[PDB]
Structure 1
Amino acid sequence: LPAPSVTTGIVDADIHPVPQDGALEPYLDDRWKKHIREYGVRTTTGLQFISEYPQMYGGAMRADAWPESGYPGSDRELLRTQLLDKHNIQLGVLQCLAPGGQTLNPAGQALNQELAAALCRATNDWQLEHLVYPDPRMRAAIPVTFETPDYAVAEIERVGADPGVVAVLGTSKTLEPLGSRKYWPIYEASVAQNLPIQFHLSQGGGHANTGTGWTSYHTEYHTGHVQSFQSQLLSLVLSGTFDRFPTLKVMFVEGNVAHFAPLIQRMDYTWETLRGELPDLQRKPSEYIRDHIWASTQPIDEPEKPEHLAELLEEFCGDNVVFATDYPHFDFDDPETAFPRSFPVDLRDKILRGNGMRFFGVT
């Protein structure tokens, strides 16, 4: 399969396909089809079928993205006409959120981690055969079990060299922060395969959805997702993880962008006084951003003053900002309308093209 190529089209780093009902079973051991029939997919909830914050309005989906049967993002043809053709996307990164039907929770977050790995492998054989290979404008970010690094490595070693795989997919929430040594075997296998890592928006993880209690209302819930990415950025950087894997690239998918810029700026300011606690950190904390930390744009930050968007993105790092549609979720972003009318064209072109090509290794 040919290496991806981006010329006059664009990069979309966050697309959510769902398998049709029963679509993963060709790739499932009989033990796990049986387990799911009798047990479902237990996770860090007390709930049989839904996550602990179920989606508020119509499943958080675009009203116009529902195929003639099934869930949105479950129609292969609808995804190529309505998203890939419609916007000339020449690199679309699939981020399979769920096996669909039974559950929308991420496959890697099943409490049974052998089942988790089963579901991740099934998602990976599926998306590669059912979308990537029939339409290689699509490439897969492969979901793996970050909470069992053994199994994550096995799966990166199995698929990770595939030309239809562009990234490794974990979640924004985890049992321990992402710079912890627990996850280093995964970073090592990723690096070994020359694969960047994408962490997407998620519930679960094992701890509450904020560092100080579970949220009540939907604004708290949905705004609250940025907090997890703020904690993971600081962990990943301040752990020295990027001293250990100096070629590792990490992208934060759907955690917004602008908040990272005063996070980093607070990280450096504090570090100026307290760096002695961390005498082996080889660089100033913000010096890791350009080589290691990227962010998807959706949902676009909407400052009260439109000119603050460009400013804040530059303060994060203007090279490390990558367009994403989040097709087909409700707060979907369109490449023509997402950026404010005063937005510098040069920033905008490279958010659409050059920045994703770099992060994903397209040259």
Structure 2
Amino acid sequence: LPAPSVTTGIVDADIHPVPQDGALEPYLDDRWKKHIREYGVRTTTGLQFISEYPQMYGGAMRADAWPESGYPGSDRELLRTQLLDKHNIQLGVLQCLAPGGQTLNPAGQALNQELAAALCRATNDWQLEHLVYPDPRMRAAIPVTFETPDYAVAEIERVGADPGVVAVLGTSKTLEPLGSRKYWPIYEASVAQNLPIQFHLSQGGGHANTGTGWTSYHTEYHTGHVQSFQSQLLSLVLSGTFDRFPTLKVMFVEGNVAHFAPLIQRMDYTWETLRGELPDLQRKPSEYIRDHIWASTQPIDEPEKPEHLAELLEEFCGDNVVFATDYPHFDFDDPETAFPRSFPVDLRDKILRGNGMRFFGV
């Protein structure tokens, strides 16, 4: 399969396909089909069929993205024409967030981690056969079980070298902050395959959705997603994970972008005083961003004064911001209208093209 080529089209770092009903069954062992029929996929809830914050308005999907039968993102033809052709996407990165007709219930978060591994492997076989190889404008970010590194390492070794794969896919929420040594074998395996890692917004993880209680209303739930990414960035940087893995690239997907700038600013300021706690950390904290931390754009930040967007994106790192649409979610961003009227044209071009080309090794 040839390497991805981006020339006059664009990069889209976050696309959500969904398998049609039964589409994963050719790839699952018999024991897991039986298990799912009898138990469903238990996770960090007391609920049979939904997550703890079920989608609010029409499944949080584009009203115009429902096909003849099935869920938005389950129709390959509609995805080719409504997304890939429409916006001339030449590298579109698939992030499968659910094994079935659902918006968000990640395979890696099944509490039966052997089932989780089986669902991740089936998703990877499915997306490569059903989407990537038939139309290699798409490439896969492969879900793995971050909470069981041995299984994730196995899956990265199995398919990580496939030219259809461009990243390893995790979740924004975890049981330990991602700088923990628990996850280091996954980083090691990813670097060995020259794969970057994308962490997509998730529920679950094992803790409440904030550091100070479970949220009540939808504003709190959705705005609160940024908090997990703030916590993860701090851990990955301050733990020295990037001293251990100096080539490891990480992208935060659907965590927003602008907030990272003042977070990193406060991180440096605090470190100037308190650095003595972490004497093995080799660089000033913000010095890790350019080489290690990326963010995708959707849902685009919308300051009251539009000029503040480019300022904050550059205060984060202008080279490390990568366009995404989030097709087919309701807060989908269109490359023709996402950026504010006065946004600098050269920054926009690299967000659409060069920045993601660098992140994915194009």
Aligned-partner Cα distance in 1 for 2:236–2:186: 13
- Contact kept? 2:19, 2:74, Cα under 8 Å: yes
1:24-60 Cα deviation digits (max 9, x unpaired): 0000000000000000000000000000000000000
Moved more, 180-189 or 98-107: 98-107
- Contact kept? 1:49, 1:103, Cα under 8 Å: no
- Contact kept? 1:14, 1:324, Cα under 8 Å: yes
User: TM-score scaled to structure 1, two decimals?
Assistant: 0.99
Shift of 1:241: 0.1
- Contact kept? 2:12, 2:89, Cα under 8 Å: yes
- Aligned-pair identity in percent equals 100
Shift of 1:101: 3.7
Aligned to 1:316: 316
1:139-165 Cα deviation digits (max 9, x unpaired): 000000000000000000000000000
**What SS does the corresponding residue of 1:286 show, helix, strand or coil?**
helix
- Contact kept? 1:49, 1:102, Cα under 8 Å: no
Aligned-partner Cα distance in 1 for 2:244–2:140: 26
User: TM-score scaled to structure 2, two decimals?
Assistant: 0.99
**What SS does the corresponding residue of 1:287 show, helix, strand or coil?**
helix
Shift of 1:102: 7.4
1:49-99 Cα deviation digits (max 9, x unpaired): 000000000000000000000000000000000000000000000000001
- Contact kept? 2:59, 2:103, Cα under 8 Å: no
Aligned to 2:150: 150
1:166-213 Cα deviation digits (max 9, x unpaired): 000000000000000000000000000000000000000000000000
Unaligned runs of 5+ in 1: none
Aligned-partner Cα distance in 2 for 1:207–1:325: 29
**What SS does the corresponding residue of 1:319 show, helix, strand or coil?**
helix
Aligned-partner Cα distance in 2 for 1:150–1:57: 38
**What SS does the corresponding residue of 1:155 show, helix, strand or coil?**
helix
Aligned-partner Cα distance in 2 for 1:327–1:216: 27
From the superposition, tell whether residues 102 and 140 of structure 1 become closer, same or farther in structure 2 (CA, over 3 Å). Answer: closer
Mapping of 1:66-215 within 5 angstroms? 66-101=66-101, 104-215=104-215
- Contact kept? 2:17, 2:73, Cα under 8 Å: yes
**What SS does the corresponding residue of 1:224 show, helix, strand or coil?**
helix
Aligned-partner Cα distance in 2 for 1:102–1:226: 22
Aligned-partner Cα distance in 2 for 1:361–1:228: 27
- Contact kept? 2:21, 2:100, Cα under 8 Å: yes
- Contact kept? 1:50, 1:103, Cα under 8 Å: no
From the superposition, tell whether residues 6 and 194 of structure 1 become closer, same or farther in structure 2 (CA, over 3 Å). Answer: same
1:212-260 Cα deviation digits (max 9, x unpaired): 0000000000000000000000000000000000000000000000000
Aligned-partner Cα distance in 2 for 1:87–1:105: 28
1:304-359 Cα deviation digits (max 9, x unpaired): 00000000000000000000000000000000100000000000000000000000
Unaligned runs of 5+ in 2: none
Aligned-partner Cα distance in 2 for 1:103–1:313: 28
Paired residues, number: 362
RMSD across aligned C-alpha pairs, in angstroms?
A: 0.7
Aligned-partner Cα distance in 1 for 2:106–2:58: 19
- Contact kept? 2:71, 2:102, Cα under 8 Å: no
- Contact kept? 1:15, 1:326, Cα under 8 Å: yes
Aligned-partner Cα distance in 1 for 2:312–2:104: 33
- Contact kept? 2:55, 2:103, Cα under 8 Å: no
From the superposition, tell whether residues 228 and 316 of structure 1 become closer, same or farther in structure 2 (CA, over 3 Å). Answer: same
From the superposition, tell whether residues 140 and 53 of structure 1 become closer, same or farther in structure 2 (CA, over 3 Å). Answer: same
- Contact kept? 2:139, 2:165, Cα under 8 Å: yes
Aligned-partner Cα distance in 2 for 1:126–1:104: 18
Shift of 1:100: 1.1
Aligned-partner Cα distance in 2 for 1:41–1:238: 35
- Contact kept? 1:198, 1:251, Cα under 8 Å: yes
Aligned-partner Cα distance in 2 for 1:53–1:100: 17
1:110-152 Cα deviation digits (max 9, x unpaired): 0000000000000000000000000000000000000000000
Mapping of 1:249-328 within 5 angstroms? 249-328=249-328
Aligned-partner Cα distance in 2 for 1:170–1:64: 28
Aligned-partner Cα distance in 2 for 1:118–1:325: 29
